[PDB]
Design brief:
The PDB classes it as hydrolase. The entry lists the keywords Hydrolase, Protease. This protein is globular. It contains 7 helices and 5 strands. 34% of the residues are buried. Helices cover 43% and strands 14% of the residues. The longest helix has 17 residues, at 80-96. The termini are close together. By secondary structure, it is an alpha/beta fold. α4 links the parallel β3 (64-68) and β4. It has a 5-stranded parallel beta sheet with strand order 2-1-3-4-5, sandwiched between helices. The protein has helices at residues 10-13, 23-30, 46-60, 80-96, 116-130, 140-144, 162-173; strands at residues 3-8, 35-40, 64-68, 100-104, 135-136.
Length: 177
């Protein structure tokens, strides 16, 4: 069975819930076929993800790698420039491992910076075009439209939202896998 590696942060690992309750675990159940490995850690910056990548690649030898990182950057100490570079290497390492990189668009809260958001957001379309890889939409956009699927912090999706996200991701990944 082929393997889809998910390299992400709390949006994929789940925030304040077990990984078994997070959408990647639900997606794996929907798929006695494609194997989904959730290598996501709440709080991980794009750099912390890149540091774990080497071992993950040579350990799971995945055909596809879903990169969902960057959202934490801007809280720890990096700029769009650094974030862009970090993600750039991740894509390179994935390609070098004969795996297909799948980049997910990330967006920050309206209250994070006037033009800072535009600079951060632009990073994804640029890299996607630079490496010519699929650029998935930010799944949280649909979740924000449903308050009942959001946690008190208005940032992370709750338990009730995971099934919807798993189905949404299945639909987006279907053509890619």
């Amino acid at each position: 069975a082929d393997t889809l590696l998910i390299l992400g942060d709390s949006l994929s690992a789940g925030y304040r819930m077990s990984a078994s309750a997070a959408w990647p675990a639900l997606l794996n159940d929907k798929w006695s076929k494609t194997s989904v490995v959730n290598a996501s850690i709440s709080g991980d910056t794009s750099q912390q993800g890149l540091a774990r990548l080497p071992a993950l690649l040579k350990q799971h030898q995945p055909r596809w790698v879903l990169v969902e990182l960057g959202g934490n950057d801007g809280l720890r100490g990096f700029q769009p420039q650094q974030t862009e570079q970090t993600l750039r290497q991740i894509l390179q390492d994935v390609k070098a491992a004969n795996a297909e990189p799948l980049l997910m668009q990330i967006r920050l809260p309206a209250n994070y910076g006037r033009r800072y958001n535009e600079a951060f957001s632009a990073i994804y379309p640029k890299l996607a075009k630079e490496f010519d890889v699929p650029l998935l939409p930010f799944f949280m956009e649909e979740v924000y439209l449903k308050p009942q699927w959001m946690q008190d912090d208005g940032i992370h999706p709750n338990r009730d939202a995971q099934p919807f996200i798993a189905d949404w991701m299945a639909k987006q990944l279907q053509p890619l896998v």
